[PDB]
């Protein structure tokens, strides 16, 4: 269909965005704008497993600097 | 398997320990045997949680031949040749009743007249015909002996003097191929029609007018009907409702002939002929495995006389002794404002 | 349905708060030049010795003294048991006989 926002919310703030579920619930209850999605937990679990396999997975920003995902 | 470990332990401890102070009681450790029995009866693919939607479901759960399990084969490894209806299934396994899911062909039902041999093979009965005369001698035949002979058809018009009429009878031959033959080569005949259809497939009226797929669906779908509070035997059924309902074991049957002494919705006490009295209890609003209700009615009265085998109480889905899974409704065939559109 | 819980606890405390109790940074160094600082509550007793989990070595304060600790019980060896059981003269004569047979 070309619907990117619906997919992004169906994948982040409805399943995995741990800090986003409570924020969206509060936004709906208080009647304001839904907040932007974060980064799902499953990606972090995958990165942790890959690192545990002695693989040097890392995410880079615009410049070649790591983000470290907290 | 349990006794193997038991005797291994027995011999080991007999050899290791002393002698002259040893008795059979202190050599035999029965833990492995009971452990193996418990392991089999629990967490085994062949010891299945029973199906109790209705008497037919329970009866069909038994008489089930499963081709998969410990020591058998696997669902995803079975090919397209083990799921076929081989021409040796006639009278030994139903070709209609099978699951419609990915288990198609790996689970079947024993035919009505099927019997299990001493070695585990399945036999079927045939009436012996000699010199073109259909005698009254029934022989039980297995697959190989069936291949040896030539078998006639159940509904063969006769002159009524136990002799074939048309002189051109359709018969099955060595390879399962059908062919017309004269009434001299024939040596066996089917005991009756519906000798190849299972118990659940023999309760579909006008089965010969139904496609095989629809008959299969109906057979697989008669096992899911729930027992209603008020049962009613079919208006147009087959001859196999009473026998199925009584043989399923969900109908209370008198043990010895007698006269009903006292009767109530909870019990029936009958004074047998030999002087002894016997009281039968009835389930009332029990619960079956599937969450339905098991409730038995009473079909006899205080003054009635009952012979052995007579039905004294109905079952979850029986009406006066015969299977009754549904109700008779006045049906009209027509489209009506789109509320019955597309199978509604 | 199955219900299970890890032996963990959760609290509603905001963590935004208004102010944190003051802390003091105590500095430690490694034998290979690696250095770090540890934050401790001001109401605390500093430990003279720590383990640098960054490099897995024992570390002492920048200006703290260097203590010495002895073995509570030395690991018993074969030789200790040999004195415990065999007498000095027995070992001496055994060694003498062994030397004699070796020379021969």
């Amino acid at each position: 269909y070309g619907a990117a926002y619906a997919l992004q919310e169906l994948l982040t703030i409805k399943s995995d965005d741990v800090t986003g579920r409570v924020k969206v619930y509060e936004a709906i209850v208080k009647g304001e704008n839904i907040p932007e999605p974060g980064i799902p937990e499953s990606f972090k679990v995958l990165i942790k497993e890959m690192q545990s396999l002695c693989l040097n997975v890392e995410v880079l920003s615009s410049d070649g600097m790591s983000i470290e995902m907290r | 398997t349990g006794l193997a470990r038991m005797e291994r332990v027995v011999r080991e401890r007999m050899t290791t320990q002393d002698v002259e102070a040893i008795t059979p009681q202190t050599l035999i450790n029965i833990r492995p045997v009971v452990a193996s029995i418990k392991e089999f009866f629990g967490t085994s693919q062949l010891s299945q949680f029973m199906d109790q939607n209705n008497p037919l479901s329970g009866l069909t759960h038994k008489r089930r031949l499963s081709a998969l399990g410990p020591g058998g084969l696997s669902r995803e490894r079975a090919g397209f040749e083990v799921r076929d209806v081989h021409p040796s299934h006639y009278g030994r396994m139903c070709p209609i009743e099978t699951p419609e899911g990915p288990n198609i062909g790996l689970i079947g039902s024993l035919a009505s007249y099927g019997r299990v041999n001493a070695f585990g093979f399945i036999e079927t009965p045939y009436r012996k015909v000699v010199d073109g005369q259909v005698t009254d001698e029934v022989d039980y035949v297995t697959a190989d002996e069936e291949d040896r002979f030539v078998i006639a058809q159940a509904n063969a018009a006769l002159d009524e003097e136990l002799r074939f009429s048309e002189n051109r009878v359709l018969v099955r031959k060595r390879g399962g191929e059908v062919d017309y033959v004269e009434p001299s080569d024939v040596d066996y005949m089917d005991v009756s029609p519906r000798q190849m259809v299972s118990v659940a497939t023999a309760m579909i009226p006008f089965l010969e007018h139904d496609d095989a797929n629809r008959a299969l669906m109906g057979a697989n779908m008669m096992r899911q009907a729930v027992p209603l509070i008020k049962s009613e035997a079919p208006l147009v059924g087959t001859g196999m409702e009473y026998r199925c309902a009584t043989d399923a074991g969900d109908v209370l049957k008198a043990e010895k002939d007698g006269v009903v002494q006292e009767l109530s919705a909870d019990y029936i006490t009958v004074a047998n002929d030999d002087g002894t009295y016997i009281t039968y209890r009835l389930h009332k609003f029990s619960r079956s495995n599937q969450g339905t209700s098991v409730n038995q009615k009473v079909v006899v009265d205080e003054g009635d006389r009952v012979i052995e085998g007579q039905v004294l109480a109905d079952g979850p889905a029986t009406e006066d002794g015969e299977m009754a899974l549904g109700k008779n409704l006045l049906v009209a065939f027509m489209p009506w404002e789109g509320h019955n559109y597309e199978d509604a | 349905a199955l219900r299970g819980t890890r032996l963990v606890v959760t609290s509603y405390e905001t963590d935004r708060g208004i102010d944190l109790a003051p802390r003091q940074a105590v500095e430690y160094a490694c034998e290979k030049g690696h250095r770090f600082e540890m934050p401790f509550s001001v109401e605390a007793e500093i430990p003279p010795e720590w383990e640098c989990k960054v490099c897995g070595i024992q570390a002492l304060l920048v200006d703290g003294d260097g203590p010495e600790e002895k073995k509570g019980k030395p690991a018993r060896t074969h030789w200790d048991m040999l004195m415990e059981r065999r007498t000095r003269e027995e070992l001496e004569e055994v060694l003498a006989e062994r030397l004699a047979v070796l020379r021969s």
Binding site: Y1, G2, A3, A4, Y5, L7, Q8, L11, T12, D16, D17, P37, G38, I39, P40, F43, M50, L53, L55, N56, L60 | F80, R83, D84, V85, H86, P87, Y90, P95, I96, T98, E100, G101, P102, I104, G105, Q153, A154, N155, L170, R172, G176, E177, V178, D179, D190, P193, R194, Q195, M196, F206, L207, E208, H209, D210, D211, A212, N213, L216 | -
Partner: protein, 421 residues
Amino acid sequence: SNAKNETIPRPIKASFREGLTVLEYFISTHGARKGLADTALRTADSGYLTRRLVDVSQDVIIREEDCGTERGLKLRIAERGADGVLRKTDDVETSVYARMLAEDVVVDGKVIAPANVDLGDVLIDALVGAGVEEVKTRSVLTCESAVGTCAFCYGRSLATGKLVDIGEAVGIIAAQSIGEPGTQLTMDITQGLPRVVELFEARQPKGVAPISEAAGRVRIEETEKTKKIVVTPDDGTDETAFPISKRARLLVGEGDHVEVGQKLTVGATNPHDVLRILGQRAVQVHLVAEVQKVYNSQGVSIHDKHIEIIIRQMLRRVTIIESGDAELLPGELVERSKFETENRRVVTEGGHPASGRPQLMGITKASLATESWLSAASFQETTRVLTDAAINAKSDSLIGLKENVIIGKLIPAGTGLSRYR
């Protein structure tokens, strides 16, 4: 049919109204059960095929309005009839409809079909009346766009009836459209869905029919448990020998004359030979026709552009044969863009331009030999992909749809484009 697939020479002479006898019902149960089992397996087979199709062509999205290319495909319309009067070709709704014209059509100095038009039934009827049989339409196979494809080559969007937008995910639409009718295709030579799986995987067919290589004379050799066809070209070059088995049914006699790609046996041609012998256009036409035959057999209508997307995805790479001095190791498949740019850089301040040959590869290999290790790992063969990427130290730039879906951000398609946001 029997339990084995073979007709029983004794029919069921009774309809379901008159009622079948016992033996007839038993005989019919055979086909009943076989059909049920085939229906059971078709679901999984089609699901796997559609998953592969989606994986190979996920990142084919429209990213331009027009590339300005003057090239296109010569498509045939209005096949001449037996009465000498032009009759519109049968399969024009799925071949030339919803497509644009690369160049203007002029007959007797009249412009009867301007370039870049939807090319509906009106224009086709006018063209046929004017007396034309060929049209140079624009296809994705011949798109010169620097980035992805462009709307004008793709043409009309069949799902909405207008020009395709500039963020459409045409690859996934093509995959879904090709894969949906899989269950309807009822399963010597493969016939149903397995035939489609064979075609899209660029495999060697079962009944392989060798195709002549050079035009010339043909001679046949006779020997026990073997047969050979020897072709001598008119140019006088070396002979070409094709071996075959005894059962093979011959199609060309001794001493006959053969064409460049004429078949020398009854069977199924393999795509690699036709490619190597007749170029990219011949293999494209062959693949499209072979894929459409299977669907037309069961009366399934699919436009050609959907298959063309997969075909162009399957012909994206070239295999290096001449070492040259372009830093490309011989025998290493390289995307045609990389090969072309390396050759461009080498010809300047360099002497040897590397040369390669077109390579046809299946959907699985093409989708696994991608530039993003995340998508390849998430497709299949995870351990091998990861242990290769780790050693190669590959870096993923997150330019596809699957990567953005995995990490949880806006896909670079539809409304996720920066042009709209």
